[PDB]
Every structure is written in structure tokens, then in C-alpha cells.
Amino acid sequence: MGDTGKLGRIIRHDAFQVWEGDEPPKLRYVFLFRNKIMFTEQDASTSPPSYTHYSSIRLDKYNIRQHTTDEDTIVLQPQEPGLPSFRIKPKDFETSEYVRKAWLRDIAEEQEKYAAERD
């Protein structure tokens, strides 16, 4: 790909420790930029593997669902041949939720600038 990438920071960027395609846990830094969700799956699979920003999702041709009622979880479903069903859990750190709660709302209406930009 190269090194022609910007910082973005236009939407949201947090690390969600979850399990993609039924495969063992990952530590992906989910970065939402413009209209796509690119998460760097920092997979501590020994040493050689891991995912150098290889995994990515686009809010165009993907199906998505969301769990709530204390258990907030964004679950995307593959409406494209290949993509697996991978969730995201509130594996933030100590106390949170309210952080990931905003993440849902973000998905429901990507780009803060579209509505009202802050900071």
C-alpha cells in the first residue's frame, strides 16, 4: 500500500478487543475515517502474522446490527462474499460503556462533521 496515509481523526479511533471471523481474539484499533471503518488488527499471533491495517470495512456494502440494554455490541453481517461476521465488545479498559455508547451512535450516523463538528 505504501506510506501515503493521513491521521484522519475526523470521526473516532478506539481499540476494541474482539474476535473476527470466529478466529481467536484480536486487538484491533478501530479507526473510522470519512465513511469507512479501518481497524488495525494487532493480532499477537506469535510474531510473523498480525494485520498491518489490512482488515477494513466500508459503510457502503456491509450489513450491520447492534445489541444494547447494558450489552452494547456492534455486529456487522457480511452481505458480500468473503467478509466474515465479526463483533466488537466493550473491552475498552477499566470503566467505560459511555465511550462505546457513542460508537454505536457514530455508526448510525457516520462523520461528526456531517451533523456538527466539535473540538
Grouping H, G, I as helix, E, B as strand and the rest as coil, residue 13 is strand
12 DSSP assignment: E
Contact 96, 70 (CB under 8 A): no
* 83 class by beta-carbon count within 10 Å (0-12 exposed, 13-18 middle, 19+ buried): middle
- Angle 68-73-75 from CA coordinates, rounded to 5°: 115
Q: Which residues make Cβ contacts (< 8 Å) with residue 105, sequence separation at least 6?
A: none
H or E element in which residue 105 lies: helix 98-108
Which residue(s) pair with 13 in the sheet? 31
Domains of the chain: 1-119 (2.30.29.30)
Cα distances (angstroms) measured from residue 90 to each of 38, 66, 110: 18, 13, 19
Exposure string over 10-26, b if 16+ CB within 10 A, otherwise e: bbbbbbbebebeeeeeb
Deposited experimental method: NMR
For residue 12, list its beta bridge partners: 32
Kindly write down the DSSP assignment for every residue of 41-87, as one continuous string: EE--SSSS---SS--EEESSS-EEEEE-TT--EEEEE--SBTB--B-
Local structure of residue 110 (DSSP, 8 states): -
